[PDB]
Amino acid sequence: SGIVPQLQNIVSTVNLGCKLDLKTIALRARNAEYNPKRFAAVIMRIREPRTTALIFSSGKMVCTGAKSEEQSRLAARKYARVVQKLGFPAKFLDFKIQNMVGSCDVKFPIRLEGLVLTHQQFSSYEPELFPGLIYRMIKPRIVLLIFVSGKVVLTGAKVRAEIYEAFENIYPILKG
Template sequence: MDSNLEVVNVVGWISYRQELDLSALADTFATRSEITSVTYEPAENHWVQSNFAPDDTYVAFYRSGRCSITGVDSVEQFKDVVGRVNTVMRDLLEFDFTPESKVSNIVVTASLDVKISLEALALQLGLENVEYEPEQFPALIYRASDSNAVILVFSSGKILCTGLNDLDVIEKTMEAFTEKIDLDT
């Protein structure tokens, strides 16, 4: 199944271990060529929204000194963005430490290559681990009892896994899930 997995989003954070002046940060970001857009509207949001060149990666900065990165499609790209963000922030904050960073969630998709009866699958998986309300959401939601994984299954056979931050664990979780289900149902 691993060749079928496609990473579609990697989410993570960086901590600068100090409070950030968001208004000053937004003003400075507006003058930086590495940042393609910046928005700070404290009446609407309590964070600075920015996009970093060259791929317009979304980075949100919070007063707490943390920032979140979302929308990259690999762990390697996440590390690259962390490096670019740290370069800009080092210029602004003049710190002499390596900020802590971590991938907090990786979203992957795959295809089972068959149409699936979600009603039958809900019964097969056991209702205690499943949410399926087709009038509310078009997918079956399976919560793995042994991890933080959440797997969405669509009748088209497309599946999505979220809630984990390690590709090896994701691969094993997806393999265990597909082995657990009877696709002939």
């Protein structure tokens, strides 16, 4: 197709294997937010990889904003080190990529009605609510937001190869 998508967001979770005290980690950290009146989790933000993490007292932690799996792993290790520095036996166990969202462009307009007429069983196009067509391909289980501008957003994959194959499979459908 001559076009390679650009991964923009990576979501991955990791278990620390130990209990945490949210008030302690929120009290001695400058980048920690904790408001138990609304949300019972700690929000932290690491700047160099430009990522944001959610920490729960049950020992689970999740990261968002990464660009690749290696950056997500680095952010998870940084957060584990931060938790360990606050007097907690945090561990880096059960790390697996949960979700990835990427963006791309085709550089030509796309008729959002021909797609829903030819691929009705794979998409739910409603211009009355949202302008972008929502395509749900079942073989890789990928969700795609398509616009008249040609730029397409892909989500639901587990590895970069899945995003690549989804894009290379949806490209002839958009071109046709």
